[PDB]
Amino acid sequence: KLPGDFGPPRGEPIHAVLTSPPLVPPPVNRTYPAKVIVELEVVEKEMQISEGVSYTFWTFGGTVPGSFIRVRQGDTVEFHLKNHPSSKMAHNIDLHGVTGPGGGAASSFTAPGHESQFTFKALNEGIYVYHCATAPVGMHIANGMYGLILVEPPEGLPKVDHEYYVMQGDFYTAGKYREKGLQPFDMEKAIDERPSYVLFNGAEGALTGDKALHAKVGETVRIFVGNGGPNLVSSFHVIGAIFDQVRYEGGTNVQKNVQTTLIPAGGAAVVKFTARVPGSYVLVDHSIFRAFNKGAMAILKIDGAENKLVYSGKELDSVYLGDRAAPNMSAVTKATQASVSGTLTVQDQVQAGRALFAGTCSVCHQGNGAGLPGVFPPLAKSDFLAADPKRAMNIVLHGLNGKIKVNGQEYDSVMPPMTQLNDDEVANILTYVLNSWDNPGGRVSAEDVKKVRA
Amino acid sequence: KLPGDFGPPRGEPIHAVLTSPPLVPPPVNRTYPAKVIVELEVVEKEMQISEGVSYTFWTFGGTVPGSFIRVRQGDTVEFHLKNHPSSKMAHNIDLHGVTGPGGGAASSFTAPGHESQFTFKALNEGIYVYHCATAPVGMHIANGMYGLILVEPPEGLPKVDHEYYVMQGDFYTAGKYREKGLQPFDMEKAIDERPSYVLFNGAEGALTGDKALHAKVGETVRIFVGNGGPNLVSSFHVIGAIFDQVRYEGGTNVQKNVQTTLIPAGGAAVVKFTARVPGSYVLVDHSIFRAFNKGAMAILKIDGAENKLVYSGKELDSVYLGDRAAPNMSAVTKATQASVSGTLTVQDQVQAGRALFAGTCSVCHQGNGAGLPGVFPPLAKSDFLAADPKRAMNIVLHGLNGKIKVNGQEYDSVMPPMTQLNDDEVANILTYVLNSWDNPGGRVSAEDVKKVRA
Amino acid sequence: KLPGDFGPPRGEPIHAVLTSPPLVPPPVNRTYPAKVIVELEVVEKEMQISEGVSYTFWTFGGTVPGSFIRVRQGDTVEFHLKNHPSSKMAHNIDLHGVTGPGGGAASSFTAPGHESQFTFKALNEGIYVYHCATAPVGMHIANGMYGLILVEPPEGLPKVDHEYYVMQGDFYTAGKYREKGLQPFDMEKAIDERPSYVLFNGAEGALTGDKALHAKVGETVRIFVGNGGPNLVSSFHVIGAIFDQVRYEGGTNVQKNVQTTLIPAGGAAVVKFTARVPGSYVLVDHSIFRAFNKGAMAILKIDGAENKLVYSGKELDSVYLGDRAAPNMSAVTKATQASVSGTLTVQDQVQAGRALFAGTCSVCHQGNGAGLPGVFPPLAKSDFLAADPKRAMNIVLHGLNGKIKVNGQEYDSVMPPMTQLNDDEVANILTYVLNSWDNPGGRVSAEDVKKVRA
Ligand code: HEC
Ligand code: HEC
Ligand code: HEC
Ligand SMILES: [Cu+2]
Ligand SMILES: [Cu+2]
Ligand SMILES: [Cu+2]
Ligand SMILES: [Cu+2]
Ligand SMILES: [Cu+2]
Numbered sequence A, B, C: 001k002l003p004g005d006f007g008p009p010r011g012e013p014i015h016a017v018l019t020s021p022p023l024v025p026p027p028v029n030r031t032y033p034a035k036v037i038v039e040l041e042v043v044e045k046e047m048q049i050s051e052g053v054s055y056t057f058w059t060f061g062g063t064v065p066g067s068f069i070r071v072r073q074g075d076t077v078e079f080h081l082k083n084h085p086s087s088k089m090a091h092n093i094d095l096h097g098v099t100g101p102g103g104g105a106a107s108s109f110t111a112p113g114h115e116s117q118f119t120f121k122a123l124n125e126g127i128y129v130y131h132c133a134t135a136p137v138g139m140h141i142a143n144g145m146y147g148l149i150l151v152e153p154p155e156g157l158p159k160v161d162h163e164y165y166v167m168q169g170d171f172y173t174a175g176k177y178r179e180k181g182l183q184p185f186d187m188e189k190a191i192d193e194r195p196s197y198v199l200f201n202g203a204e205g206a207l208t209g210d211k212a213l214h215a216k217v218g219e220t221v222r223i224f225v226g227n228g229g230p231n232l233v234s235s236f237h238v239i240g241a242i243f244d245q246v247r248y249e250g251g252t253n254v255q256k257n258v259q260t261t262l263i264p265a266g267g268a269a270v271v272k273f274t275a276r277v278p279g280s281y282v283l284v285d286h287s288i289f290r291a292f293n294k295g296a297m298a299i300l301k302i303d304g305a306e307n308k309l310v311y312s313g314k315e316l317d318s319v320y321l322g323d324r325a326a327p328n329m330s331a332v333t334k335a336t337q338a339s340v341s342g343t344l345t346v347q348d349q350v351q352a353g354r355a356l357f358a359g360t361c362s363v364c365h366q367g368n369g370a371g372l373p374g375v376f377p378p379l380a381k382s383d384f385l386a387a388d389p390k391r392a393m394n395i396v397l398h399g400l401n402g403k404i405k406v407n408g409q410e411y412d413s414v415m416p417p418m419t420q421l422n423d424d425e426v427a428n429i430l431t432y433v434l435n436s437w438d439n440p441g442g443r444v445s446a447e448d449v450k451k452v453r454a
């Protein structure tokens, strides 16, 4: 009568091995139901949500999303939740897929330095979100308290070459996007569902550049995709590919051959991809400003031979991926820390500005600052730049239009304002430009930009 | 050629018996098509959207959602809409599932004190939203003008033990969440899709506590779930359970074994649940701040024997459900009315504060005010509280951090601000605390809190 | 091994014939794979987003959405993107359905006056969004850079009587809804996902009135429905009908017999409708304030015989469709241009006000200004209006309640405020009323209303 009716646990008790994102535990590879002991510890800690931007995350297992749990339908799971002594808050857990009130919540309340346990049978196959369930629930979830549990079918999932773990969340900082420093949680933005960041795996760039997911032409890739929310619904999409299969939770329905699929807040799906041609495939929330303005992009990078019969074109670059085309933006972290320490050098600024110039400025002005004849004026050896570095701050913040002369040529176009750039970002970008391409050197400070903005 | 081609109406004309939420009319239990006469009356009236918060609802049949209508595919429906003489606005109806322009709208315009009628054939089986269709349509829908009509398949739906009627809506008050008094509709929040409340069945607590839906272990429950909007899409989810089946409108596709499912604005679904273990199962919009900060939670409470093989844990409490764990919050309504009348007593405040303290404060400070050793300081017989009741107002509104001494013990933690609490709520909560646990008595007034907030 | 494995291209190279919305190219009607040459040109230009409201759109082929492209699964597509010399920005393309990084983006970067090309095989059948992929991607998409490409199955889609092309988008103007003039793109509203317009096919009224889609009773209609976003998810719905079929992208799953269906940002679906009774069927985003307050309504108008057995009622009118019931609102465009030119006459205002009065005022006051006895007072020959035209400006902006006397009769009701109306709209509406129905004439100016609003 109950699903998952495979008899009492047999064999030996199994201690679950949990993995950190973006990795997944191995398939259970088991033909009998077991007692599975799961131990998960809550840790509150600061981490970088973006370069030079710290946030106090609340985590299951030290990561956002939390550690991945993998069991078999019909297993009896003895769930142990610990809360690290350093925690200020109590925490608990609601696992979707659990049959019982709160998905475990009332029997997993755990004060700092304590441990709780409860037992459940995994009656329901599927991929499922788990999350904290402690008042105020939204604050806990917003601070990163979510992950995935996979309950396998008894026969296991079909074999694939790679399995990965990707989870979207919306985040609410007091400061604006890319404003540096330790950013508090912002309850007002959270209630209004107005996130400052929308991320995969807890940070900007968590899955881009040198942190990309990998596979090779011809391989299959399964991705366990969660949406921790707390509030957003993801228009989840793969740029330049298709999903062979998309299956939500433990649903009977499987959709095949779709590129764009809606993942509810608190939802999860298993997607399958087959690599056909090399290059970078971007996982996004196709509510586009999330993907391109708030951090909601991840990369699956495929290595192998080009097939000109299928696609003649080139790998992605900064025109599309912006400043996440490059391996990383570590120079930005280093410049921000140098500013805090009072040791910020011109070169710290130049290297940070170099990272930030990609896409943001280079789409028009080019990576070498040459511009494009008749269309975009040069930043390289620019007389107009050199003539008035203050004017340049105004141009970045407030745009520029009308006829101008640069290096003896007339331009009569429109540079849109870029007011969303933070003071340090404008300063560092301009300091990069001034110290490149035979420009006159010197520097622009965040304080200089603050004054022009005001 | 047309669907629902079951011949002319036969038998006798049937006068439809409509039900008020959360109840549903009985199955039609009929093998022939009939002429079904439906009579529905619009009533504009004030009701409580939350305790002590009045709202002028516009209703079909006196409730939000409106009366449930149940007919059989192939029926000829003669639809009579009356508008009560007390109405200020004209009203009409668009029933999804109707084949014809506006779903009835142009032939159901009805001024106060009037009646309109129109006839349609129910060609389409399914569950369908109906709503008002009078300019400005969004205002009408926002004020509560929506419900469900079920068009059964000719053979009927499979028998279940219980059928219930649950409908989500987003609401737009001029005041903030839980600000007392008669709250006007707020057009600006509505246009921006920024609701102050997100509710099931027209009120906070409409389906919680003593108003929960009921069933017993082993029983099946069918829920007709609507989303009246006007604007939100529900990440509709059952905490601690799974839906055996989810079917949208009259779709051919049926999803099985899912826990989280997206319901469009203006959409409807039929979900099935089988009770397996006792306790409270929470229906939520899993865009979490709606569920936990704006009212979007309902309860299906299952009675019966525990099954420790399936779930070893406990029923839900205020850690998860907050102040909706208790049967009701009537003390809040009574205190608010006493304030209006100028008769507010200390005990009125104490009992209101008692209701509001649950979850909101008790998650940390505990239901007996004892706190937790080394972690959360006591409110019970608190020297620190007694020493400066004004400081306590500041602590609730603006939080507290750093080393403090309470009852001879050091704490060095963080109480987050609770600025979203209204002045009366802080006043009543603190008055409760002061009159409990050997604390010194007295009271805090809403005016006292207003001054500290300013 | 790869899908679409139908061999090398054969026959002659085919130059694709692209269509402008809401039309679709003819079925490919071809049994062999071909080399298909597609030429699409980007044009930046001002167009009217609403009457008297200009916007600088960025377009593929001069329209929003862009030109429709129709090919066959297994075709080799040689894609040529041109950027008109008048462009200020560079542009490129990402076609969903393309197998390769960026869906073409890196190999289609095209400066003003240039052309790019790349080749891909259409491995994936389905309906797919294409869009620009140039940093800042959200700005490009927000400015109108999206369209659809259909990749047919090898056997073709089933024949229907009509095929149409409808695409939703969200738009972000600096000014509020219906504020006249050339409206800049508003980055802040875009990041916050707070659109001022939500439209089908690039403009208010693009598919209403004299621009409605057409078919006849008994005919089948296929609509290729895109959602360009950038940010919104459409609760896509047909008022007064049902979709026989809804199929997303190239998915295997087909839903049948649904009225309301969620289309992701960047998503696309093929829907089928069978006309059964005459009248206007409204395609909306059923997040209702979008449909009724921001422009998100389109019409499929069915001609033919009434069938009283199916629906006894009347065609839609301004009670539901508001000011889009009429063929067009050209008088508003003409009045706005007359204001710019300094030649605005009383009659220009009267005719603009006539257009705007429909629904907005007529729902209560009636199309002849008679009101409804005991319920809504007359505007026709209104003593109360004539007595104080300034008071009338205040009534429109700020509402009216309480007992009043009009033409010898008492009213004691509530006219809600209509503060969202722009100054010119109030002026023109009141000038219409004053010059109708034996009212005293004269005029109200936008400046008059500006002063009352302040
Ligand atoms: C294309 C959309 C651009 C992006 C992105 C950026 N800039 Fe730009 N810039 C652009 C144009 C079309 C113009 C000329 C405007 C005109 O009136 O014709 C400019 C101009 C400048 C200048 C001044 C001229 C010069 O020295 O060449 C500066 C200093 C400049 N732009 C800097 C700059 C930086 C630092 C950018 C990233 C932050 C950036 N621009 C983006 C077009 C575009
Ligand atoms: C956990 C998240 C808490 C919730 C919810 C509430 N309070 Fe709290 N409170 C908390 C901590 C960790 C502290 C100490 C902070 C420190 O600096 O170490 C406090 C403190 C108080 C106090 C002062 C100390 C005392 O008298 O014990 C008061 C008066 C107090 N808290 C009241 C209070 C009320 C009324 C709450 C609901 C509105 C509430 N707190 C919530 C932790 C938490
Ligand atoms: C119903 C929801 C209404 C809509 C839409 C509009 N008006 Fe109205 N109006 C309405 C009522 C119930 C009243 C009387 C209020 C009372 O206190 O009883 C009015 C009144 C007016 C008046 C003044 C009285 C008169 O001259 O008849 C004016 C000038 C007026 N209304 C104008 C007006 C216009 C121009 C509207 C569209 C912009 C409009 N009203 C909408 C009800 C409703
Ligand atoms: Cu927690
Ligand atoms: Cu959950
Ligand atoms: Cu109404
Ligand atoms: Cu509707
Ligand atoms: Cu572009």
Ligand SMILES: [Cu+2]
Pocket (backbone or CB within 6 Å): A286, C094, C096, C129, C131, C266
């Ligand atoms: Cu895309």
